[PDB]
């Protein structure tokens, strides 16, 4: 209905205003953008879903979220992917990790904060009903 894009539009509102702060932030500098191929070349088959926040961006236009479920889905994969590239125990591998724990930490928290519990619940209840 009307009524149910105007959610929807809030939504989007809502996580375009959350990831331009993430996307600000210094720490997280490195998931701003994907993934070169030329200046990483291993990337790209050890990583088979690639994202980061400026995909997020372009989803977030395209109305791919229809609940911060989905959304958190995407930010989850940053970290993951970012784990599971960089494992060793180097210092360079460990910063990243710490950042992409950030990312993650810093948007549940901004989430948990910020968007009513019962807002999520209507997505998701239009969501389930399409
Ligand atoms: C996305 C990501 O996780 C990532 N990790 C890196 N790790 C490394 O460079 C070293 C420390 N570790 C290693 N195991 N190569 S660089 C990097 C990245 C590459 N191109 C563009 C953007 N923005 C980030």
């Not at 395209?62 to 599971?84: F, G, M, P």
């Amino acid at each position: 209905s009307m009524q149910e894009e105007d959610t929807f539009r809030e939504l989007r509102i809502f996580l375009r205003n959350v990831t331009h702060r993430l996307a600000i932030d210094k720490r997280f500098r490195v998931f701003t953008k994907p993934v070169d191929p030329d200046e990483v070349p291993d990337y790209v088959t050890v990583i088979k879903q690639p994202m980061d926040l400026s995909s997020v961006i372009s989803k977030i236009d395209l109305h791919k979220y229809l609940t911060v479920k989905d959304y958190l889905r995407d930010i989850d994969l940053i970290c993951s992917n970012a784990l599971e590239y960089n494992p060793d125990r180097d210092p360079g591998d460990r910063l990243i990790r710490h950042r992409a724990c950030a990312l993650r930490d810093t948007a549940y928290a901004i989430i948990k904060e910020e968007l009513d519990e019962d807002f999520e619940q209507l997505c998701e209840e239009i969501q389930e009903s399409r």
